[PDB]
């Protein structure tokens, strides 16, 4: 009759156990309340699937040649222009994007793997918006433009500027407007180990990692100012930023 496949975006789609005459597969999935159909040219529950929502939108469903990504997608009623495109990647993230009456994106949401996301919102033609990070705690608030992401956090005369590159890259800097060279901040970036020294009156204070685990920690230097003591501990609120930056 027909086999069950697990989808990813905790989905399902059920293929006929054999091919009809053309050699093709029939497919059926439920997405949500939305019964999906179609007919694909392989067997193990890839190919194309179509709907349309109660209010007449299309809605389409893509599952890749090997079942590593799916695509889920709502249109205008004439198929025409994209309303909204869920993808989840064969690592389990995912992109959820929301589109204008033009088919230009004006919202996306990024879930990594471990949860933690990147919201994207008022996004204008020129790829700028508004950007939130949504980490395990805490959130950090910015804008984005199509050079990169920068989230802010603001404590004393001091500023931290948390830097995504359009490429993914990270990068961290921190400016202090005390001058002050007994109280002012000054900060280092080393990209080799995503690490930002902090120095105060030429010793370095602190180390915050901002870890591939999209965390981040703190560790604070002896008062000698050249060996780190004690372990990093990891930042679990936004007031422990804060702390550190004072």
């Known amino acids: 009759n027909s086999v069950s496949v697990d989808l990813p975006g905790s989905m399902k789609v059920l293929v006929s156990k054999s091919s009809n005459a053309d050699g093709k597969y029939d497919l059926i999935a439920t997405v949500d309340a939305l019964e999906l ?3 694909s040219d392989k067997n193990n529950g890839s190919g194309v699937l179509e709907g349309v929502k109660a209010d007449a939108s299309k809605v389409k469903l893509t599952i890749s040649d090997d079942l590593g990504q799916t695509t889920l ?3 205008k009623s ?3 222009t994209l309303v909204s495109k869920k993808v ?5 993230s995912s992109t959820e994007e929301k589109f204008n009456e033009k088919g230009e994106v004006s919202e996306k949401i990024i879930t990594r793997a471990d949860g933690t996301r990147l919201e994207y919102t008022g996004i204008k033609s020129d790829g700028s918006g508004k950007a939130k990070e949504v980490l395990k705690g805490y959130v950090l608030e910015g804008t984005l433009t199509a050079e990169k992401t920068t989230l802010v956090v603001k404590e004393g005369t001091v500023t931290l500027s948390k830097n995504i590159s359009k ?3 990270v990068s961290v800097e921190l400016n202090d407007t005390d001058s002050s ?3 002012k901040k000054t900060a280092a970036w080393n990209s080799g180990t995503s690490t930002l020294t902090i120095t105060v009156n030429s010793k370095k204070t602190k180390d915050l990692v901002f870890t591939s685990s999209n965390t981040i920690t ?3 230097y002896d008062s000698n100012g050249t060996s ?3 372990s990093a501990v990891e930042i679990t609120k936004l007031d422990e930023i804060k702390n550190a930056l004072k």
């Open 167 to 169: 490429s993914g890259a």
């Open 73 to 75: 997608e709502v249109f």
């Open 228 to 230: 780190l003591e004690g």
């Open 78 to 80: 004439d198929g025409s």
């Open 88 to 92: 989840t990647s064969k690592d389990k």
């Open 218 to 220: 703190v560790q604070q």
């Open 181 to 183: 060279a007994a109280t």
């Open 37 to 39: 159909s179609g007919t």
